[PDB]
Write a protein that holds these residues in place. Structure first.
Motif, PDB file in Angstrom:
ATOM      1  N   UNK A  19     -30.680   1.943  91.304  1.00  0.00           N
ATOM      2  CA  UNK A  19     -30.316   1.223  90.256  1.00  0.00           C
ATOM      3  C   UNK A  19     -29.081   0.409  90.317  1.00  0.00           C
ATOM      4  N   UNK A  20     -29.085  -0.586  89.619  1.00  0.00           N
ATOM      5  CA  UNK A  20     -27.834  -1.683  89.681  1.00  0.00           C
ATOM      6  C   UNK A  20     -26.583  -1.069  89.859  1.00  0.00           C
ATOM      7  N   UNK A  21     -26.019   0.144  89.171  1.00  0.00           N
ATOM      8  CA  UNK A  21     -24.962   0.562  89.110  1.00  0.00           C
ATOM      9  C   UNK A  21     -24.651   1.960  89.177  1.00  0.00           C
ATOM     10  N   UNK A  22     -23.503   2.512  89.633  1.00  0.00           N
ATOM     11  CA  UNK A  22     -22.964   3.742  89.759  1.00  0.00           C
ATOM     12  C   UNK A  22     -21.798   4.079  89.094  1.00  0.00           C
ATOM     13  N   UNK A  23     -21.848   4.696  87.844  1.00  0.00           N
ATOM     14  CA  UNK A  23     -20.728   4.892  86.779  1.00  0.00           C
ATOM     15  C   UNK A  23     -19.963   6.201  87.375  1.00  0.00           C
ATOM     16  N   UNK A  24     -19.171   5.916  88.364  1.00  0.00           N
ATOM     17  CA  UNK A  24     -18.344   7.038  88.987  1.00  0.00           C
ATOM     18  C   UNK A  24     -17.343   7.821  87.600  1.00  0.00           C
ATOM     19  N   UNK A  25     -17.568   8.755  87.248  1.00  0.00           N
ATOM     20  CA  UNK A  25     -16.627   9.094  86.388  1.00  0.00           C
ATOM     21  C   UNK A  25     -15.735  10.165  86.866  1.00  0.00           C
ATOM     22  N   UNK A  26     -14.344   9.865  86.491  1.00  0.00           N
ATOM     23  CA  UNK A  26     -13.248  10.914  86.994  1.00  0.00           C
ATOM     24  C   UNK A  26     -12.492  11.413  85.635  1.00  0.00           C
ATOM     25  N   UNK A  27     -12.937  12.343  84.835  1.00  0.00           N
ATOM     26  CA  UNK A  27     -12.653  12.671  83.693  1.00  0.00           C
ATOM     27  C   UNK A  27     -11.222  12.934  83.296  1.00  0.00           C
ATOM     28  N   UNK A  28     -10.759  12.853  82.021  1.00  0.00           N
ATOM     29  CA  UNK A  28      -9.183  12.951  81.824  1.00  0.00           C
ATOM     30  C   UNK A  28      -8.984  14.371  81.122  1.00  0.00           C
ATOM     31  N   UNK A  29      -7.841  14.766  81.390  1.00  0.00           N
ATOM     32  CA  UNK A  29      -7.414  16.224  80.824  1.00  0.00           C
ATOM     33  C   UNK A  29      -5.947  15.839  79.951  1.00  0.00           C
ATOM     34  N   UNK A  30      -6.009  15.214  78.941  1.00  0.00           N
ATOM     35  CA  UNK A  30      -5.094  14.342  78.436  1.00  0.00           C
ATOM     36  C   UNK A  30      -3.871  15.024  78.119  1.00  0.00           C
ATOM     37  N   UNK A  31      -3.916  16.203  77.473  1.00  0.00           N
ATOM     38  CA  UNK A  31      -2.420  17.013  77.413  1.00  0.00           C
ATOM     39  C   UNK A  31      -1.706  16.987  78.564  1.00  0.00           C
ATOM     40  N   UNK A  32      -2.411  16.777  79.768  1.00  0.00           N
ATOM     41  CA  UNK A  32      -1.884  16.387  80.933  1.00  0.00           C
ATOM     42  C   UNK A  32      -1.330  17.593  81.727  1.00  0.00           C
ATOM     43  N   UNK A  35       3.284  17.703  80.390  1.00  0.00           N
ATOM     44  CA  UNK A  35       3.495  17.117  79.346  1.00  0.00           C
ATOM     45  C   UNK A  35       3.227  18.215  78.015  1.00  0.00           C
ATOM     46  N   UNK A  36       3.064  17.599  77.058  1.00  0.00           N
ATOM     47  CA  UNK A  36       2.787  18.710  75.738  1.00  0.00           C
ATOM     48  C   UNK A  36       2.349  17.924  74.845  1.00  0.00           C
ATOM     49  N   UNK A  37       1.063  18.419  74.017  1.00  0.00           N
ATOM     50  CA  UNK A  37       0.612  17.939  72.872  1.00  0.00           C
ATOM     51  C   UNK A  37       0.629  19.017  71.803  1.00  0.00           C
ATOM     52  N   UNK A  38       1.309  18.675  70.736  1.00  0.00           N
ATOM     53  CA  UNK A  38       1.704  19.583  69.625  1.00  0.00           C
ATOM     54  C   UNK A  38       0.942  19.162  68.527  1.00  0.00           C
ATOM     55  N   UNK A  39       0.752  20.157  67.456  1.00  0.00           N
ATOM     56  CA  UNK A  39       0.013  19.840  66.120  1.00  0.00           C
ATOM     57  C   UNK A  39       0.619  18.855  65.408  1.00  0.00           C
ATOM     58  N   UNK A  40      -0.040  17.894  64.906  1.00  0.00           N
ATOM     59  CA  UNK A  40       0.355  16.867  64.171  1.00  0.00           C
ATOM     60  C   UNK A  40       1.014  15.693  64.768  1.00  0.00           C
ATOM     61  N   UNK A  41       1.059  15.872  66.392  1.00  0.00           N
ATOM     62  CA  UNK A  41       1.905  14.881  66.814  1.00  0.00           C
ATOM     63  C   UNK A  41       1.073  13.673  66.917  1.00  0.00           C
ATOM     64  N   UNK A  42       1.904  12.632  67.521  1.00  0.00           N
ATOM     65  CA  UNK A  42       1.350  11.089  67.526  1.00  0.00           C
ATOM     66  C   UNK A  42       1.995  10.584  68.784  1.00  0.00           C
ATOM     67  N   UNK A  43       0.964   9.879  69.470  1.00  0.00           N
ATOM     68  CA  UNK A  43       1.546   9.267  70.621  1.00  0.00           C
ATOM     69  C   UNK A  43       0.364   8.488  71.489  1.00  0.00           C
ATOM     70  N   UNK A  44       0.576   8.352  72.740  1.00  0.00           N
ATOM     71  CA  UNK A  44      -0.543   7.389  73.573  1.00  0.00           C
ATOM     72  C   UNK A  44      -0.820   8.293  74.952  1.00  0.00           C
TER      73      UNK A  44
END
Ligand SMILES: [Ca+2]
Ligand SMILES: [Ca+2]
Lengths: 49, 49
Positions: A19-32, A35-44
């Motif tokens: 098949x023409x292509x191989x979409x190798x995925x390396x997934x993201x665990x974004x709170x990382x 780091x820290x992701x809080x409720x109501x927080x905003x960021x990138x």
């Protein structure tokens, strides 16, 4: 004495394997990590690959 | 009195402080004025009966 049926042949084959292509995925665990992701927080969050 | 501890991501916080039993303390006090001495000398809050 023979009336030849005048037909000779040539042949070839075509190989479509992959098949023409191989979409190798390396997934993201974004709170990382470290780091820290809080409720109501905003960021990138960025994953280069 | 109230220490606000944030996580490593949170940067902007809006707190609503509310006095619920003020109508009871109205029967005990004649004037009571609470100044929430804020972060570093600022006084951002003032509650009364
Ligand atoms: Ca493949
Ligand atoms: Ca944030």
């Amino acid at each position: 004495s023979v009336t030849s049926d005048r037909t000779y042949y040539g042949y070839g084959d075509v190989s479509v394997k992959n098949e023409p292509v191989n979409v190798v995925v390396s997934p993201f665990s974004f709170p990382g990590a470290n780091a820290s992701l809080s409720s109501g927080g905003q960021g990138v969050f960025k994953k280069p690959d | 009195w109230i220490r606000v501890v944030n996580q490593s991501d949170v940067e902007n916080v809006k707190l609503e402080i509310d006095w619920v039993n003020a109508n009871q303390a109205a029967n005990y006090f004649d004037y009571a004025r609470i100044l929430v001495t804020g972060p570093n000398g600022q006084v951002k809050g003032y509650l009364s009966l």
